[PDB]
């Protein structure tokens, strides 16, 4: 039973937790927009082996996930849930938060994403052999970029993506519903205060984030069948914990 004063404190707390756990400052990503991979560099990426490209991408995803774990740990009320629930929420939601955070590193003007120090198009990722997954992620990032999120809106929205009381496996489901309700109030209060309530209808449905995560696990399984020793010997242990089952 949170009050208006407590709701405003929650807004500031979430926004602070987010700013502290950004891998890249938004200003740094915007200032790098003219730093684009040349045609020779794109060709170099396309000539990389499928296994080398998968390992590089899994490493980059793992680094991004580590920041999401830290965001969760700083998130008001998350560390108060039992460890089983903390792990359920991170296993189901870490990739979804990374997918939303990715729109900051996406330049809708030329359809490029910041990857390994420069901006490149989806053609940079051709060696992975998961064209449908890559194009869906780029489409998703393009659609989110059209919302023109502020950093505070991403902070509030990503807190809600993570604190989802519907995840299967939660033991303290009511405690999570209460935290989710308070974060929903904080988010909707901020939108109301900044006259941005129009974005509510424009946010992706939860099924969209679920579809993208499911496609990622499916393409990982195909790669794992082709190069099992690459996954075992060369994929990050956190990545295997979240997406292979250890």
């Amino acid at each position: 039973g949170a009050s208006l004063t407590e709701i405003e404190h929650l807004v500031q707390s979430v926004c602070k937790s987010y700013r502290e756990t950004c891998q890249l400052r938004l200003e740094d990503l915007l200032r790098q927009r003219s730093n684009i991979f040349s045609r020779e560099e794109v060709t170099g990426y396309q000539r990389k082996s499928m296994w080398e490209m998968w390992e590089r991408c899994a490493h980059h995803l793992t680094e991004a996930i580590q920041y999401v774990v830290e965001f969760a740990k700083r998130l008001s009320g998350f560390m108060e849930l039992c460890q089983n629930d903390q792990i359920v929420l991170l296993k189901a939601g870490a990739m979804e938060v990374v997918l939303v955070r990715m729109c900051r590193a996406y330049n809708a003007d030329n359809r490029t994403v910041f990857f390994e120090g420069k901006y490149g198009g989806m053609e940079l990722f051709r060696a992975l052999g998961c064209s449908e997954l890559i194009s869906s992620i780029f489409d998703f990032s393009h659609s989110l970029s059209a919302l023109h999120f502020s950093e505070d809106e991403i902070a509030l929205y990503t807190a809600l993506v993570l604190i989802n009381a519907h995840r299967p496996g939660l033991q303290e489901k009511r405690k999570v519903e209460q935290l989710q309700y308070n974060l929903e109030l904080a988010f909707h209060h901020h939108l109301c205060k900044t006259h941005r309530q129009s974005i509510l209808a424009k946010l992706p449905p939860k099924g969209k984030l679920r579809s993208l995560c499911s496609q990622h696990v499916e393409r990982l399984q195909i790669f794992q069948h082709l190069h099992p020793i690459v996954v075992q010997a060369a994929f990050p242990p956190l990545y295997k914990e979240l997406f292979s089952g250890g």
């Binding site: 580590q66 774990v69 740990k73 460890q83 903390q86 792990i87 991170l90 296993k91 242990p237 956190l238 914990e241 979240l242 250890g246």
Partner: peptide
């Protein structure tokens, strides 16, 4: 293993 360690490391 990893997730438990990250969550415990204060």
């Amino acid at each position: 293993k990893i997730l438990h360690r990250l969550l415990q490391d204060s």
